[PDB]
Ligand binder design. Sequence first.
Ligand SMILES: NC(=O)c1ccc[n+]([C@@H]2O[C@H](COP(=O)([O-])OP(=O)(O)OC[C@H]3O[C@@H](n4cnc5c(N)ncnc54)[C@H](O)[C@@H]3O)[C@@H](O)[C@H]2O)c1
Ligand SMILES: NC(=O)c1ccc[n+]([C@@H]2O[C@H](COP(=O)([O-])OP(=O)(O)OC[C@H]3O[C@@H](n4cnc5c(N)ncnc54)[C@H](O)[C@@H]3O)[C@@H](O)[C@H]2O)c1
Ligand SMILES: OC[C@H]1O[C@H](O[C@H]2O[C@H](CO)[C@@H](O)[C@H](O)[C@H]2O)[C@H](O)[C@@H](O)[C@@H]1O
Ligand SMILES: OC[C@H]1O[C@H](O[C@H]2O[C@H](CO)[C@@H](O)[C@H](O)[C@H]2O)[C@H](O)[C@@H](O)[C@@H]1O
Ligand SMILES: OC[C@H]1O[C@H](O[C@H]2O[C@H](CO)[C@@H](O)[C@H](O)[C@H]2O)[C@H](O)[C@@H](O)[C@@H]1O
Ligand SMILES: OC[C@H]1O[C@H](O[C@H]2O[C@H](CO)[C@@H](O)[C@H](O)[C@H]2O)[C@H](O)[C@@H](O)[C@@H]1O
Ligand SMILES: OC[C@H]1O[C@H](O[C@H]2O[C@H](CO)[C@@H](O)[C@H](O)[C@H]2O)[C@H](O)[C@@H](O)[C@@H]1O
Ligand SMILES: OC[C@H]1O[C@H](O[C@H]2O[C@H](CO)[C@@H](O)[C@H](O)[C@H]2O)[C@H](O)[C@@H](O)[C@@H]1O
Ligand SMILES: OC[C@H]1O[C@H](O[C@H]2O[C@H](CO)[C@@H](O)[C@H](O)[C@H]2O)[C@H](O)[C@@H](O)[C@@H]1O
Ligand SMILES: OC[C@H]1O[C@H](O[C@H]2O[C@H](CO)[C@@H](O)[C@H](O)[C@H]2O)[C@H](O)[C@@H](O)[C@@H]1O
Ligand SMILES: OC[C@H]1O[C@H](O[C@H]2O[C@H](CO)[C@@H](O)[C@H](O)[C@H]2O)[C@H](O)[C@@H](O)[C@@H]1O
Ligand SMILES: OC[C@H]1O[C@H](O[C@H]2O[C@H](CO)[C@@H](O)[C@H](O)[C@H]2O)[C@H](O)[C@@H](O)[C@@H]1O
Ligand SMILES: OC[C@H]1O[C@H](O[C@H]2O[C@H](CO)[C@@H](O)[C@H](O)[C@H]2O)[C@H](O)[C@@H](O)[C@@H]1O
Ligand SMILES: OC[C@H]1O[C@H](O[C@H]2O[C@H](CO)[C@@H](O)[C@H](O)[C@H]2O)[C@H](O)[C@@H](O)[C@@H]1O
Lengths: 451, 451
Amino acid sequence: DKLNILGVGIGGRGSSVLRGLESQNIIGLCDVDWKYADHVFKRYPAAKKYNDYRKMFDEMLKSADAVMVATADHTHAIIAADAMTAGKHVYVEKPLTHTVYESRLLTKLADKYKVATQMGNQGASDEGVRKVCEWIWNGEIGEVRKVETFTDRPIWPQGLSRPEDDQRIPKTLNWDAFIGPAPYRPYNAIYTPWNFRGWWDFGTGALGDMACHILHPVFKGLKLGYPTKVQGSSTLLLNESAPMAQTVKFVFPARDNMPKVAMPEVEVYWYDGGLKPARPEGLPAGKDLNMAGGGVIFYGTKDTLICGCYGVNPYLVSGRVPNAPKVLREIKESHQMDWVRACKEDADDRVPSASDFSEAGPFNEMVVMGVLAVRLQNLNRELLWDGPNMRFTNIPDDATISAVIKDGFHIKDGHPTFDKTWTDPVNAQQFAQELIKHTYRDGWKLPDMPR
Amino acid sequence: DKLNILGVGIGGRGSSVLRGLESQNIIGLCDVDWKYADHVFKRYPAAKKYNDYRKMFDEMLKSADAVMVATADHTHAIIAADAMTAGKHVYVEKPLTHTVYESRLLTKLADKYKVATQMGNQGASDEGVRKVCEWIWNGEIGEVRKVETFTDRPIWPQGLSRPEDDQRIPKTLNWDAFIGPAPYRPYNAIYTPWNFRGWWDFGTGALGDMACHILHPVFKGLKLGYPTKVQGSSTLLLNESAPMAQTVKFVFPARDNMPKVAMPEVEVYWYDGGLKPARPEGLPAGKDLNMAGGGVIFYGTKDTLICGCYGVNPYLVSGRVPNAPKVLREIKESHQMDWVRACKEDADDRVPSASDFSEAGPFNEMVVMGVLAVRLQNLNRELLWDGPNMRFTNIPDDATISAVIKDGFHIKDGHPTFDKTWTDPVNAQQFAQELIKHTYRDGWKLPDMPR
Ligand SMILES: NC(=O)c1ccc[n+]([C@@H]2O[C@H](COP(=O)([O-])OP(=O)(O)OC[C@H]3O[C@@H](n4cnc5c(N)ncnc54)[C@H](O)[C@@H]3O)[C@@H](O)[C@H]2O)c1
Ligand SMILES: NC(=O)c1ccc[n+]([C@@H]2O[C@H](COP(=O)([O-])OP(=O)(O)OC[C@H]3O[C@@H](n4cnc5c(N)ncnc54)[C@H](O)[C@@H]3O)[C@@H](O)[C@H]2O)c1
Ligand SMILES: OC[C@H]1O[C@H](O[C@H]2O[C@H](CO)[C@@H](O)[C@H](O)[C@H]2O)[C@H](O)[C@@H](O)[C@@H]1O
Ligand SMILES: OC[C@H]1O[C@H](O[C@H]2O[C@H](CO)[C@@H](O)[C@H](O)[C@H]2O)[C@H](O)[C@@H](O)[C@@H]1O
Ligand SMILES: OC[C@H]1O[C@H](O[C@H]2O[C@H](CO)[C@@H](O)[C@H](O)[C@H]2O)[C@H](O)[C@@H](O)[C@@H]1O
Ligand SMILES: OC[C@H]1O[C@H](O[C@H]2O[C@H](CO)[C@@H](O)[C@H](O)[C@H]2O)[C@H](O)[C@@H](O)[C@@H]1O
Ligand SMILES: OC[C@H]1O[C@H](O[C@H]2O[C@H](CO)[C@@H](O)[C@H](O)[C@H]2O)[C@H](O)[C@@H](O)[C@@H]1O
Ligand SMILES: OC[C@H]1O[C@H](O[C@H]2O[C@H](CO)[C@@H](O)[C@H](O)[C@H]2O)[C@H](O)[C@@H](O)[C@@H]1O
Ligand SMILES: OC[C@H]1O[C@H](O[C@H]2O[C@H](CO)[C@@H](O)[C@H](O)[C@H]2O)[C@H](O)[C@@H](O)[C@@H]1O
Ligand SMILES: OC[C@H]1O[C@H](O[C@H]2O[C@H](CO)[C@@H](O)[C@H](O)[C@H]2O)[C@H](O)[C@@H](O)[C@@H]1O
Ligand SMILES: OC[C@H]1O[C@H](O[C@H]2O[C@H](CO)[C@@H](O)[C@H](O)[C@H]2O)[C@H](O)[C@@H](O)[C@@H]1O
Ligand SMILES: OC[C@H]1O[C@H](O[C@H]2O[C@H](CO)[C@@H](O)[C@H](O)[C@H]2O)[C@H](O)[C@@H](O)[C@@H]1O
Ligand SMILES: OC[C@H]1O[C@H](O[C@H]2O[C@H](CO)[C@@H](O)[C@H](O)[C@H]2O)[C@H](O)[C@@H](O)[C@@H]1O
Ligand SMILES: OC[C@H]1O[C@H](O[C@H]2O[C@H](CO)[C@@H](O)[C@H](O)[C@H]2O)[C@H](O)[C@@H](O)[C@@H]1O
């Protein structure tokens, strides 16, 4: 007796996800690009097709139990939020949302409406993260105070300028439903499909593409919540496009200790774009820190624990392979079909799936927080974050922010010229508020925060 | 009595340097590009002009006392080396050489021939580095075990492909004398004037352009020598062009202690291309780490000492202005005219200038060693360096190296493609030997290492 699922954003990842769900009932499909997406729609010949989720939701929500969402980052929130208010379970690809306010909105709506929820970081349903947690929690490495994490991404070009040409909107593409709540701009294929990753207003760069896969063991294993301090630096930082390489450093406060391991204040370093943490003491020359596209090094007082992306293949530098007590549930079905199971339990008995918004909500808040760190970098200050009120506490009321628009380097009869164009300065406090909570384009509205 | 000076590489920096020496006698000028450099030649209308340093040296060495060198990096060594074997003092812009072997060659030749020498890092003759040394040496910050250094450079584009079109050699440009001992290639104006910085075979990137200015306080003040370990990582690493941004980590061994401060094993971090060290504890929010294009943070057991590029404006995080005994020679003449003075002293009474190759020789070896770190990065290992024999000790003979030639990312009706083209693998041990000591193109010969 099957879940009725609507899909929204089916052309890319959404394709393989709907594959997971096929046992069920795909009854409605909604993509904005009927060309990129065609292959999928006619894999599900029985599903009424749409190209604006709001027409689909009007007609078809009354016939649906769940909603899968694999759109570009900046619309996940508003789609998911409209579905939960309607009583509907939602799978939502990672990253969960584009902003911090949105992540917190979703966490609070999941709670309020009592609906199965799942972020699309599927390495949360794998074995490797269960072994990292069961080991740290049995004190196998001791107290953890410094963590280093990295990806090799971006592997596409970032550092892009807004295209200066024109291009007409294809007949197959609903360019307005794509912009959604973001600020409107002239269409170009540099923005979709796929390449939205490197654009501030749509994607979250390497952070959004890879950090939810890489940092999930660090967040669950150290039972992290809100950080207290964050700082970032990067290669040339532009106003519309993410940079080629960034370093971010977070600091989290001490948490309750556990019986076999203490949970002190921990510093979490993130590197990407080629940049790597320096090699741990004890690690063999020649062992690659990258496994499946990234690495984590937990520096512990008694030993050093290393894993790959998706938490794969954890090992201790010393050579010891612990045999710690089993504590986390072993997920037997897939990452998607576990979410399905959760949808069919009554709210009162429901065993949440591995990426329920209760965990992934706050987790995404840390990933997306790294964006704020990198863009506010010119403030030249550890940024102090108050988590419960979603604001920095330590930005002066008269400091300002300016980004580079375009680099103008050129040589001129041998002598060089370092021209550059910069945006108009805005108030740093308002800049920041707006990265944390976006002002939605007219005709686009989130549901209210509860509580 | 006046110094007879030849100049070699006069168009760019060489211009302002010849300005310093004007009090003397500029009798010979040799540039390869008679167009870029015309302005200079006719500032010194009496100087026999050449475009190949070896013709000039034949005709005019027997008439010269000294030789100024401000060519592109990769020829400094061979020019300087031929001058010193002839009994001639040399000023040589920074970086001193392109390779480590060359730096060691020059240090040993200065010693053997007893000639005044000066590297062109003029911040060595300035005040701020005397204050950093007099303070460290008087225990004002205590023992230093961790140093962080950075520049905002490169401020020009690197990450370049060999140009695919052709241009003809102007009549004004002796493109062969330019290549010198480097491997020959078709001419293009992407290679000179000025822009050679971004090309492995000619320049050393941001390292060569800024690190001798930034790291000179760290080397002199901690009385460093050979490091024992290095490692590096970077953005996209190409086979002919330096990258957008790099991080290097050096480790030096403990040195003799001084009366008032101990000299333990110290780690030196280097960042560039926008990447910055995390902010020190104690430092005011808002205060910029960059001063005159870079920053140095000496982390001490009792206090934190910060300076800018060229060692400018050293301050302690605490707020104290120490008042340490004066120890280093206070340079009253200019950076160039001090070297001149040194040339006119008899060898046995010569007070060396502030950048005599006895110091700058080893100093450059560390700067240029950061290149080796970045290019050997794929070996996935802390590299152990044996200084006295100029080789790594921990590169396997089985292992090989491959660089990216050009990135082929493109999207194609929405579906993306991650092509990249790679060089043919070469033996890693021989690759490295050759970066340390280049094999000179036939017809180009360094002097022997002295016995
Ligand atoms: N879990 C993983 O392994 C994983 C892998 C890849 C992508 N993702 C995530 O999944 C999401 C999709 O990325 P992708 O590479 O598949 O993108 P894509 O652009 O390749 O495909 C997304 C599809 O959504 C459609 N779409 C976009 N905006 C829409 C909107 N507003 N309304 C309706 N349809 C819309 C697009 O036209 C396209 O067909 C992102 O959040 C991404 O980071 C997760
Ligand atoms: N001390 C500093 O502040 C500083 C400043 C600028 C440059 N530099 C250094 O000085 C050097 C030159 O830099 P630049 O910006 O003047 O370069 P440039 O390319 O602008 O000028 C170099 C000049 O030398 C000529 N030349 C090049 N190769 C030659 C060769 N083999 N023989 C003879 N002439 C040759 C060139 O045509 C040009 O006339 C580099 O080593 C660079 O790092 C140091
Ligand atoms: O009227 C309450 C809700 O009814 C539907 O959902 C219920 O039944 C679904 C079928 O199993 C379950 O998936 C769901 O958990 C139940 O609450 C509908 O999904 C909701 O939108 C209504 O709010
Ligand atoms: O997280 C705790 C500390 O971890 C590091 O140090 C521990 O582990 C090292 C090897 O991984 C050992 O050198 C050392 O003995 C341990 O203390 C790190 O050195 C510290 O900065 C962390 O606080
Ligand atoms: O960087 C873009 C994507 O990288 C990862 O995806 C690739 O690697 C996975 C591991 O083999 C494959 O399953 C996947 O099919 C590949 O494209 C990452 O998992 C994605 O989320 C990124 O978008
Ligand atoms: O925490 C201070 C230590 O710094 C070095 O090592 C720590 O951090 C390194 C990463 O840059 C790791 O390689 C190392 O395992 C960490 O403990 C250094 O090894 C030590 O002298 C310091 O204790
Ligand atoms: O990401 C949202 C927008 O960010 C940039 O714009 C802000 O920053 C400018 C100065 O750095 C201000 O002039 C402007 O008011 C801000 O909105 C970017 O330039 C925009 O295009 C983005 O949409
Ligand atoms: O792209 C739409 C608007 O963006 C900027 O404004 C947003 O963010 C501001 C802070 O930088 C807020 O003051 C404002 O509420 C937001 O709309 C820009 O300043 C506006 O001029 C644009 O319309
Ligand atoms: O005739 C012997 C040397 O002649 C030159 O050197 C002398 O004259 C110069 C005047 O200051 C100085 O370079 C040098 O210190 C003197 O030795 C020539 O430079 C050398 O090659 C000869 O040994
Ligand atoms: O140079 C050796 C150590 O330097 C630092 O330690 C001192 O400086 C810190 C602030 O810059 C102090 O807070 C710290 O407590 C001092 O001991 C550095 O923090 C250490 O990592 C180095 O071992
Ligand atoms: O990276 C460009 C160059 O930066 C420095 O030089 C600039 O700034 C100096 C003082 O700020 C001036 O003397 C000089 O005229 C400027 O070009 C640095 O000295 C150079 O080596 C760099 O190449
Ligand atoms: O050395 C272990 C310390 O880790 C941090 O230490 C360094 O980095 C800080 C910020 O990036 C600096 O302020 C500090 O001076 C460095 O030692 C941190 O200071 C502490 O939690 C640890 O002692
Ligand atoms: O000095 C740099 C030169 O080396 C690079 O190529 C070397 O390494 C290649 C693989 O990365 C080998 O195939 C080759 O034998 C080596 O010379 C670079 O590719 C060249 O541009 C430079 O001449
Ligand atoms: O264009 C550069 C010339 O040298 C290259 O070879 C050097 O590096 C090799 C290892 O990568 C050494 O084995 C070799 O002896 C060196 O000369 C290149 O392989 C040659 O084709 C070029 O002539």
